[PDB]
């Protein structure tokens, strides 16, 4: 049901992601591959995400190319990351080396640092919203996407959202939260990369009470070969104290990411 302007210039392919749907497409003039995200409309949440996607341009954030708006849906031509999401990559590989995990955290922290410099909190940083990028070198980067929950922090936020595995304890406590919930989610992800399981796993109230306690353990034998530098960084990212918890700048300054 797609407008002529899109089909005129793009050959729409298979669905690659399923509120919205994402499809593969080929730009006819160049044969270069892109992504088409189709957001269905109701008879304010879409306006917010496009306003964010218009402002965010960063090599580690999925780029918005152009918008085609019709009454029933909104069409977004977006960058295609051909690696797939990080969730599928973690399912196939089990765990990563410290060198691979540290380079991936460098990409995530770069995107978060850029977002926080705009006072944008993502609020949905998780492996399903990270995309693995294939370089010419064979090296792989990460790109952050899906800003449907992103918002500008002009004061403390209180709305509970995000996937519980990655949700910061201040969100669960409903006492107010800001940009640093993104750092906590990045800390949980880094922890998953280094060992293959989340730091807080629960049994749904068990998981929340464990996050609120925020006791990060590095169990044997899974963490025996992991460096103390990595355990220090993850610990500083997963601090319950919002003031002591690392900012994205502090994450990037840490030796393990350098
Ligand atoms: C070949 O590329 C992919 C393959 C798979 N599948 C998964 C299923 N498996 C059976 C085969 C491999 C998946 C994805 C991508 N790519 C991708 N490139 C760009 C996205 C995006 N997904 N979608 C889906 C997004 C997903 C999360 C966050 C943002 C986006 C976002 O806004 N954009 C614009």
Residue numbers in the entry: 381 to 398, 401 to 425, 431 to 590, 594 to 648
Sentences from the study reporting this entry:
Doublecortin-like kinase 1 (DCLK1) is a multi-domain bi-functional protein that belongs to the protein kinase superfamily and the doublecortin (DCX) family within the microtubule-associated protein (MAP) superfamily. Doublecortin-like kinase 1 (DCLK1) is an understudied bi-functional kinase with a proven role in tumour growth and development. Multiple isoforms of DCLK1 exist, generated by alternative splicing. Here, we report the crystal structures of DCLK1 kinase domain in complex with DCLK1-IN-1 and its precursors.
